[PDB]
Amino acid sequence: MEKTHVQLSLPVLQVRDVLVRGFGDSVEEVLSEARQHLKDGTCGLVEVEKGVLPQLEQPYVFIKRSDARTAPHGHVMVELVAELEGIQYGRSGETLGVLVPHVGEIPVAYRKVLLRKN
Numbered sequence: 001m002e003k004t005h006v007q008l009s010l011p012v013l014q015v016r017d018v019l020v021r022g023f024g025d026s027v028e029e030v031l032s033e034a035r036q037h038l039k040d041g042t043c044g045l046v047e048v049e050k051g052v053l054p055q056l057e058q059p060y061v062f063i064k065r066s067d068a069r070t071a072p073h074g075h076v077m078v079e080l081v082a083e084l085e086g087i088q089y090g091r092s093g094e095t096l097g098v099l100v101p102h103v104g105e106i107p108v109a110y111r112k113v114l115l116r117k118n
């Protein structure tokens with residue numbers, strides 16, 4: 001049925017190219033839509049630099065590194081943590097980026113992850 005982890009290659013997008021700048025309007029919604037878009041292959045990743053977060057829509061969904069030992073074929077193990085008004089629901093490791101819908105924008109790279117589905 002549903003393995004706990006799935007290997008994915010996510011398109012990395014520059015923030016100014018992103019057309020849909022968040023997944024929804026609550027913490028529960030953004031996590032739910034992030035997971036659906038991951039399942040459908042319509043999820044992109046924006047790497048965080050200065051000025052990136054203010055250009056995206058809260059609540060944010062981050063992918064964070066969940067394990068230090070495991071990266072099969074560079075698929076870094078990650079889990080999802082959401083943020084609303086400065087509070088994060090969950091705790092994990094280093095932030096690898098912020099997830100956004102992908103609607104056909106051209107990426108600058110692909111990031112390989114081993115995603116904890118829940």
Ligand SMILES: Nc1ccc2sccc2c1
Pocket residue numbers: 006034035036038039040115117118
């Ligand atoms: N195949 C696939 C890819 C990503 C995700 S996220 C939750 C379920 C799921 C399934």
